[PDB]
């Protein structure tokens, strides 16, 4: 909230928001004359980068990986279009009902409810994910009722 003030107004077209190329505190030391050689290969680098999403986990992967090699082959040994557009149709439904039936995480909900006193855990995890329609904890009326232990 202090938010200190401002100063002798700068060029409207200041060439590049940067330090003026006098004190550019290294030429060739910021972009080029820099590299060495360390490690880490190729394949154990690729199959250690497709897994920083856990993108699918189980069956939800099989129906997502074996689909493209079934809708690129489809444009060969040709099959009528109706078959091809119910194939993609039943996919978009099966993949959806598995996504929306996955657990919930704190970042999903409202901002005013994201910031609890770290009682959010037993308010959301194993509390929300263990019922269907109970609304005993219906605290979406925000005035800070918080209605929990």
């Amino acid at each position: 909230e202090p938010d200190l003030q401002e100063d002798p107004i700068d060029k409207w077209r200041t060439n590049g928001v940067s330090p003026e190329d006098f004190v550019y505190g290294v030429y060739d030391g910021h972009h080029t004359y820099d590299e060495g050689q360390e490690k880490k290969g190729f394949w154990e680098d690729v199959s250690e980068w497709y897994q920083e999403a856990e993108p699918p986990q189980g069956f939800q992967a099989l129906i997502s990986w074996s689909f493209p090699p079934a809708v690129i082959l489809g444009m060969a040994f040709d099959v009528p279009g109706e078959y091809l557009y119910i194939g993609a149709a039943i996919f978009i439904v099966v993949f959806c009902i598995i996504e929306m039936d996955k657990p919930d995480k704190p970042h999903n909900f409202e901002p005013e409810i994201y910031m609890m006193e770290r009682s959010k855990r037993d308010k959301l995890i194993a509390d929300y994910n263990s019922m269907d329609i109970w609304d005993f904890n219906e605290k979406y009326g925000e005035l800070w009722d918080f209605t929990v232990n």
């Binding site: 928001v17 940067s18 279009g81 557009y85 149709a89 329609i133």
Partner: protein
Amino acid sequence: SYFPWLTILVVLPIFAGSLIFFLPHKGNKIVRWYTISICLLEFLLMTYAFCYHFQLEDPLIQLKEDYKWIDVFDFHWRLGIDGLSLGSILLTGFITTLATLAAWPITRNSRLFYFLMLAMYSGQIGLFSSRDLLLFFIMWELELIPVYLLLSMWGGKRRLYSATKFILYTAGGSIFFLIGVLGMGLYGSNEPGLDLERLINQSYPATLEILLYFGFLIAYAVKLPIIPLHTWLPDTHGEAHYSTCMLLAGILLKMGAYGLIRINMELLPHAHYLFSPWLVIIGAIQIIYAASTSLGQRNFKKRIAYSSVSHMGFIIIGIGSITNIGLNGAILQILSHGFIGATLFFLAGTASDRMRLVYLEELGGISIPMPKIFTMFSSFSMASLALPGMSGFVAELVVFFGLITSPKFLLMPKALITFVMAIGMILTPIYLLSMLRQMFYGYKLFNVPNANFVDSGPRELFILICIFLPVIGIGIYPDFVLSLSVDRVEALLSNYYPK
């Protein structure tokens, strides 16, 4: 065939979104998937209707049907797809699905929001598929409230002033449209009158053609920004959430051109043929005026808004200069701009919300922390530069060819207007690269802390790539969007009478 497609294609989104209401399930999670599944289903049904239930070889209407609705002023459920409509319908489905996807991490309301998105979806398709003039007007004004709510609930600092100016301005602009409706509805209402197909043979008297033409042209110039009627755009674009603004500056603008093509050039020829040259002049001066005022702005969102304004001069000049390709190059232009402007606003709204600085002077070197945004931003800037290869080139090229080979001109303005139009190519990079250089190049402070600075994840990157690939695919071989044989009958009426 008689199994109605367009009726389903119009009543599916709003209906299947009305179930979001009366569904107590969660805060944000399930609604995102329940909306994206409906959007994908709708898009798949659209492409199924287009592929095996369309001909590309006959200039009549396809998949039409009608009913009886109010019956006092003859106004039916008349509905039908045609050549001109098809491209915009497909583009609307595509870009609105991708916008709904880009709206993924919204948890403020997340229940009214997706429902309003689906409502705007259904309204856009309803307009683009209309076949009854009054129903066209209904679909036109149906979307006016959802967009106001999306503006006033999410987006920008001064959301309120922008939203109220936009809604008042558009509602006022539609008044002249309703005037034209009342004008040509009562003109022999025993002859169908309100059936946009059976109006091709209307022979109105003089001094009435002009009034209806102007009553529609004013509303269109309101919707599609024309120079003296453009003041509303920078406010309602620089303040809208990027999810909204994608579909807003990629579809809602192009309605002002689709309507002008469908109800002016097809219905009122001798009211449009005696008014084409001034349209051409206005578009020619707009192409340079929009850029010359874009270069002056200082917050890049308004700069992108003005760049979107500028390209709307090619559409104008293609509507005038009455040829097959000049009208036809306009459609390719509205497609290749619904892509580029939408993607550019998405990139602007995604770079921002990460830096929280709107004025283009303090933007340091953002290339160091996030490379992929820089790459996908420079690529689409090149696209907007009318650079060859990408689809931002062939549209303008065909527009030039349409103006040059026009029959309603004899070499005096056919060259000076081409000159003033080509000045746009000298002018546009001066203001695009001036942003690319201030906001991305240069070495700012040692922005090493990987906090509030993360390159685009999988969702945003896939959105960027999936919108980018069509640009290349069209710009390399632009006969994917020249599947238009209505112009061979659309420009058939005009082509011999006087003058």
